[PDB]
Amino acid sequence: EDICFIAGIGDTNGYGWGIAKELSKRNVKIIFGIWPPVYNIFMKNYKNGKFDNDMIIDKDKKMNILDMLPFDASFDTANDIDETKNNKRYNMLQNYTIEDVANLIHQKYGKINMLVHSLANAKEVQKDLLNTSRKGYLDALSKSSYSLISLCKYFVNIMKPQSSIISLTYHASQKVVPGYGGGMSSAKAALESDTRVLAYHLGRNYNIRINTISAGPLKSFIDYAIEYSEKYAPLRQKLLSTDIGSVASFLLSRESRAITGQTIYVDNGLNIMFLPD
Amino acid sequence: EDICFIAGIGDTNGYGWGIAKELSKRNVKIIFGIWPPVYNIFMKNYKNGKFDNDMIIDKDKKMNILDMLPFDASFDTANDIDEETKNNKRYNMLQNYTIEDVANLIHQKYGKINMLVHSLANAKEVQKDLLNTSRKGYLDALSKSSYSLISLCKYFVNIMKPQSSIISLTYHASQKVVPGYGGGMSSAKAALESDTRVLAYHLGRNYNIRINTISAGPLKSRAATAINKTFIDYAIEYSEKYAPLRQKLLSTDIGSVASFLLSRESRAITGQTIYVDNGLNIMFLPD
Numbered sequence: 001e002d003i004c005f006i007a008g009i010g011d012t013n014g015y016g017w018g019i020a021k022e023l024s025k026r027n028v029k030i031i032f033g034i035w036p037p038v039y040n041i042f043m044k045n046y047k048n049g050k051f052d053n054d055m056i057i058d059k060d061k062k063m064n065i066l067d068m069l070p071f072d073a074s075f076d077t078a079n080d081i082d083e084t085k086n087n088k089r090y091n092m093l094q095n096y097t098i099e100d101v102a103n104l105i106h107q108k109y110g111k112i113n114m115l116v117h118s119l120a121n122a123k124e125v126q127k128d129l130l131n132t133s134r135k136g137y138l139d140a141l142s143k144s145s146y147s148l149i150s151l152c153k154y155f156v157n158i159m160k161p162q163s164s165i166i167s168l169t170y171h172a173s174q175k176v177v178p179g180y181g182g183g184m185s186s187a188k189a190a191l192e193s194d195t196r197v198l199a200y201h202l203g204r205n206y207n208i209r210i211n212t213i214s215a216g217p218l219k220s221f222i223d224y225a226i227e228y229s230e231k232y233a234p235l236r237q238k239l240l241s242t243d244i245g246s247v248a249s250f251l252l253s254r255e256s257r258a259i260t261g262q263t264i265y266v267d268n269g270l271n272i273m274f275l276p277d
Numbered sequence: 278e279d280i281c282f283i284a285g286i287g288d289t290n291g292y293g294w295g296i297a298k299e300l301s302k303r304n305v306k307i308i309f310g311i312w313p314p315v316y317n318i319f320m321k322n323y324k325n326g327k328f329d330n331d332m333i334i335d336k337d338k339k340m341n342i343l344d345m346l347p348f349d350a351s352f353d354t355a356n357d358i359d360e361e362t363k364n365n366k367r368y369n370m371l372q373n374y375t376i377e378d379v380a381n382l383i384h385q386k387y388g389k390i391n392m393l394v395h396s397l398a399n400a401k402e403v404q405k406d407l408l409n410t411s412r413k414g415y416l417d418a419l420s421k422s423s424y425s426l427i428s429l430c431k432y433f434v435n436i437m438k439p440q441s442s443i444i445s446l447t448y449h450a451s452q453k454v455v456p457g458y459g460g461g462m463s464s465a466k467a468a469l470e471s472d473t474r475v476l477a478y479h480l481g482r483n484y485n486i487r488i489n490t491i492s493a494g495p496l497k498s499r500a501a502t503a504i505n506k507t508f509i510d511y512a513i514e515y516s517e518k519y520a521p522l523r524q525k526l527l528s529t530d531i532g533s534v535a536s537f538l539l540s541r542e543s544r545a546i547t548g549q550t551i552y553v554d555n556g557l558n559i560m561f562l563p564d
C-alpha cells in the first residue's frame with residue numbers, strides 16, 4: 001500500500017491539505033511534515049477536533065493520517081542546527097531536519113512512494129525584488145528551492161522505484177507579478193528549472209518522476225489575484241485546493257508514468273491570457 | 278454515464294486506440310470516427326475478431342465499443358463535399374461523414390456526449406522539408422491537422438454538456454526543430470497548440486468546456502511510418518536512449534493521460550499543452 005509524505009502544512013486552508021484530501025480517496029496513507037514553530041499548535045487544533053469536518057472524504061471515510069511530524073526545510077541534517085536547537089519553539093522537539101525525518105519515517109513505516117513539497121517562505125515578500133536584501137533573497141531560495149533538492153537527496157533512499165514527487169510553484173516565475181516580492185519569484189523560477197534537472201537525474205538513476213504544479217491563487221494581494229483570476233480566467237469556477245489535489249493525485253500515480261520534469265498549470269487557464277478584456 | 282467520440286482511428290496501432298482502451302477501463306462509452314479510406318478494412322478486421330487480443334484490457338476486462346462511424350475531418354458539412362469524393366469508390370457507399378452530420382447523428386442516436394478526442398493528422402507533402410513544401414501541400418496540412426480541430430469544436434459544443442472536455446494530440450516539432458517532420462506538419466502542430474489556447478478561452482467562458490492538447494513522444498503507428506522518404510525508428514531509439522525515463526512509450530501511456538484530462542479530475546486545467554514523452558522535451562544536450 002501507498003504512503004505519501006507531505007512536507008509543509010500548517011493548517012487546513014492550503015494546498016497540502018487539499019492534496020492530502022484527494023490522495024485519501026485513493027487510500028493513500030498520509031504523513032504530514034509540519035514546520036516546528038507551528039507544530040504544537042497544529043497538534044492542539046487536531047486533538048481539539050478543529051480539523052474533523054475538514055477530514056471528511058465522503059459518506060464512508062475520513063482522511064487516513066498515518067503520522068504528523070515536525071519538519072524544518074531549513075536544515076539538511078542534525079549537524080546544521082545553530083541556540084536554535086534550544087530556542088523556545090524548538091527545544092521540546094527532536095529529529096526535525098530533512099535527514100532526520102527521512103530516517104524516522106523509514107524506521108517506523110519502511111519505504112514510501114509519494115513525496116509532496118509544499119513549502120514557500122520569503123521573509124521579505126512584501127519588499128519588491130529590487131529592494132530585497134541578500135539575506136532575504138538567499139533565505140527564500142534556501143527554504144523554497146534548495147529544500148526541494150535536499151528533500152529528493154534524502155528521501156530517494158527511502159522510496160520505491162516508480163515513486164513520484166511533486167512540488168508547488170507559481171506563474172510569477174515566468175511573468176511579472178508586482179507584489180510577489182522578496183525573491184519568491186526567483187525561488188519559483190529556480191524551483192521549476194530544478195524540477196527538470198532533478199527529473200533527468202532521478203529518472204535515469206532511480207526511475208523516479210518529479211513534476212511541479214503551477215497553481216492559481218487560493219487564500220490560505222492574494223485578494224487581488226483571486227479577484228482578477230475569477231474575473232478573467234477562461235473557467236469562471238472557484239479554484240479549490242482539491243482542484244490542485246486531484247491533479248497532484250494523478251501526477252503521483254502510475255497513470256502519469258510517462259510525465260516527468262513538467263510544470264503543469266492548474267489555474268482555471270489564467271496563464272494562457274495576455275490581454276484582459 | 279460518459280460518452281466519448283474519438284476522431285482518428287484506423288487500427289489498433291495508434292494513439293486513438295490506446296486512448297479508447299484507457300477510457301474503457303473507466304467505463305466510458307466510446308464512439309469511433311473512422312476515415313472512409315480505411316473504414317471498410319477496419320470494420321472487416323473488427324468483425325473477423327482480428328482486434329480481439331487488442332481489446333483485452335486485463336485478465337478480466339475487454340474494451341466495449343458503442344459505435345463505429347465513417348468520418349472525414351476535411352469536410353465541415355455535406356455541402357463541402359466535392360463531387361469527385363462523393364462518388365469515389367470508398368466514399369460513395371457511406372453517409373453522414375462530415376463534421377456536422379456526424380455530430381447530428383451521434384446526438385440523434387445517443388444524446389449529448391461529454392468527451393471529444395481529436396487524434397488525427399495529414400499532410401500530403403510530409404516527406405518534403407518545409408522550405409520545399411508547396412502552398413497547396415502546406416494548406417492541406419493546416420486544413421486537415423489543425424482547422425479540423427476548430428471545426429470539430431464548433432459543431433460538437435452543441436452536443437456536449439457543460440463541464441465536458443476536449444483533447445487533441447500534438448508533437449514537439451512545433452516548438453523545436455525536428456528536420457524530418459516536413460510538409461508543414463510542424464506548422465500545423467504550432468497552430469493547433471495556439472488554437473488550443475484561443476479555443477480554451479472561448480469554450481471556457483461561453484460553455485464551461487475545457488480543451489487541452491497532449492504532446493506525445495514517438496510511437497510506431499501507421500501514420501508515423503508514412504513519414505519516412507526510417508524517421509520514427511530513429512525518433513523511438515533516440516527517445517529510449519536519451520529520455521529521463523528510459524522505457525518504451527506505450528499508446529496507453531498517452532491513453533491514461535487523455536483519460537485524466539477528459540475526466541473531472543482535471544477541471545482546473547485548460548488551454549494547456551501537456552507533454553507525455555518520458556520527459557524527452559526537457560533535454561538540451563543528449564549525453
Ligand SMILES: NC(=O)c1ccc[n+]([C@@H]2O[C@H](COP(=O)([O-])OP(=O)(O)OC[C@H]3O[C@@H](n4cnc5c(N)ncnc54)[C@H](O)[C@@H]3O)[C@@H](O)[C@H]2O)c1
Pocket residue numbers: 007008009010011013014015016017034035036038071072073074117118119120121143168169170171214215216217218219220222
Ligand atoms: N496559495 C497560493 O495562492 C499559491 C499559488 C501558487 C503556488 N503556491 C504554492 O503552494 C505551496 C503551499 O502554500 P500554501 O498556500 O498551501 O500555504 P500552506 O500554509 O498550506 O503551506 C505552506 C507551508 O510551508 C510551511 N513552511 C514555511 N517554512 C517552512 C520550513 N522552513 N519548514 C517546513 N515548513 C515550512 C508553512 O508553515 C506553510 O504552512 C507553496 O509552495 C506556494 O508557493 C501557492
Ligand SMILES: NC(=O)c1ccc[n+]([C@@H]2O[C@H](COP(=O)([O-])OP(=O)(O)OC[C@H]3O[C@@H](n4cnc5c(N)ncnc54)[C@H](O)[C@@H]3O)[C@@H](O)[C@H]2O)c1
Pocket residue numbers: 284285286287288290291292293310311312315348349350351395396397398399421446447448492493494495496497498499500501
Ligand atoms: N505516432 C507519433 O509518434 C506521434 C507523435 C506525437 C503526436 N502524434 C499525434 O497523434 C495523433 C494520431 O496519430 P498516430 O500516430 O496515432 O497515427 P494514426 O495512424 O493512428 O492516426 C491517424 C489517423 O487519423 C485518420 N485520419 C487521417 N486523416 C483523416 C481525416 N481526413 N479525417 C478523419 N480521419 C483521418 C487516419 O485514418 C488514421 O487512422 C495525430 O494527431 C498525431 O499527429 C503522433
Ligand SMILES: O=c1oc2cc(O)ccc2cc1Oc1ccc(Cl)cc1O
Pocket residue numbers: 119120121122123125169170184216217218222225
Ligand atoms: O505558502 C506560502 O507561504 C509564503 C510565505 C511567505 O513568507 C511569503 C510568501 C508565501 C507564499 C505562499 O504561497 C503563495 C500564496 C499566494 C500566491 Cl499567489 C503564491 C504563493 O506562492
Ligand SMILES: O=c1oc2cc(O)ccc2cc1Oc1ccc(Cl)cc1O
Pocket residue numbers: 396397398399400401403447448462494495496500501502503504509512
Ligand atoms: O497522425 C499522423 O498523420 C500523418 C499523416 C501524414 O500524411 C503524414 C504524417 C503524419 C503523422 C502523423 O502522426 C505523427 C507520427 C509521428 C510523429 Cl513523431 C508525429 C506525428 O504527428
